[PDB]
Amino acid sequence: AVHLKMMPEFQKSSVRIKNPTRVEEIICGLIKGGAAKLQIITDFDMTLSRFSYNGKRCPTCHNIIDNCKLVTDECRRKLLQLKEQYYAIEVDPVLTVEEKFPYMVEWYTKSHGLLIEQGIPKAKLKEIVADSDVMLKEGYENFFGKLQQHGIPVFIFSAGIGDVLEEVIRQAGVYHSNVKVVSNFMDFDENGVLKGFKGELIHVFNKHDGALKNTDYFSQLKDNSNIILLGDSQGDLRMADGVANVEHILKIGYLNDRVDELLEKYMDSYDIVLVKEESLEVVNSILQKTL
Ligand SMILES: [Mg+2]
């Protein structure tokens, strides 16, 4: 039987749970099913990676390129302005999520388009990432290592840059076979320089779309009817729309920011909310009981 009261990881003051008995019931199903029934579906930026370090704000996969030596200060002025105009839209409380779709497409298309202009070679991404300020959450080695140990599917679903994401996890030693990455991947020309992005755009609000267009992946995993979902945005809640059959799903949300504005919405939509939390210990503690 599961008791969150007896799990020291859940006593941390960053842990917000609206419905503890409901959560206990889900973790209880997760445990019952064990390895055989489990898969992970996860956002990357600010979920697997840190939102902040030494009083310092950590980069997203996009920020890694924005900030690198291969991009002018003049490109960074444009990128900044874009963020100011379009982030105001993203967080606008009066607009419906649906009304924001076209704005998001515009933002990612404009900002990717400035990066394409800077001329990013594939061969250089290794060093760009090594020199970057990127940080994985405390407990990542344990997170990925228990998962690979038990062959648990991990579907990282990211509106970031997939090439950047992969380099981060590769340099961290956690890009194991069990880890599938769906993201905005770069498209390279003859010389291995960036010319555009592959496929259809994944942004913060349309993960339902990509989730359904990954049938390929989810139907092979019919038997994995227990899901752990991790996100930091409301849009990450749609990341499991493509799952065959769902028996138990636990939704864990990182609330990193805008805490007073978003806490109620987060507590109502995610099962567990992790306020200003830079580790993976609550999910690791659930993996430990389960695996
Ligand atoms: Mg994120």
Residue 47 Cα to ligand 1 middle (Å): 5
Which tokens in the block code for residue 31?
């445990």
Identify the domain containing residue 277 by its residue range. 1-47+134-187+206-291
Note if 45 is an active site residue: yes
**Cα angle 118-121-122, degrees, rounded to a multiple of 5:** 140
The structure's method of determination equals X-ray
Residue 231 Cα to ligand 1 middle (Å): 6
Assess whether 124 and 142 both reside in one domain.
no
Assess whether 39 and 77 both reside in one domain.
no
**80-88: long-range contacts (C-beta < 8 A, 24 or more apart)?**
82/107, 82/110, 82/111, 82/114, 83/111
Q: Is 159 annotated as a binding residue?
A: yes
In one-letter notation, the amino acid at residue 1 is A
Contact 290, 23 (CB under 8 A): no
Place of tokens 């980069």: 59
Residue 49 Cα to ligand 1 middle (Å): 8
User: Which resolution, in Å, applies to this structure?
Assistant: 2.3
Catalytic residue among 43, 66, 236, 271: 43
Which tokens in the block code for residue 262?
């978003």
Supply the CATH number for residue 154's domain. 3.40.50.1000
Catalytic residue among 45, 66, 163, 271: 45
Which tokens in the block code for residue 5?
């009261």
Provide the domain count of the chain: 2
**Residue 25 placed within a domain:** yes
Which tokens in the block code for residue 28?
């209880």
Assess whether 6 and 121 both reside in one domain.
no
**Residue 161 placed within a domain:** yes
**Residue 114 placed within a domain:** yes
Assess whether 125 and 138 both reside in one domain.
no
Assess whether 254 and 279 both reside in one domain.
yes
Supply the CATH number for residue 77's domain. 1.10.150.340
Distance between CA atoms of residues 141 and 154, nearest Å? 14
Which tokens in the block code for residue 229?
């979902």
**Residue 284 placed within a domain:** yes
Assess whether 69 and 153 both reside in one domain.
no
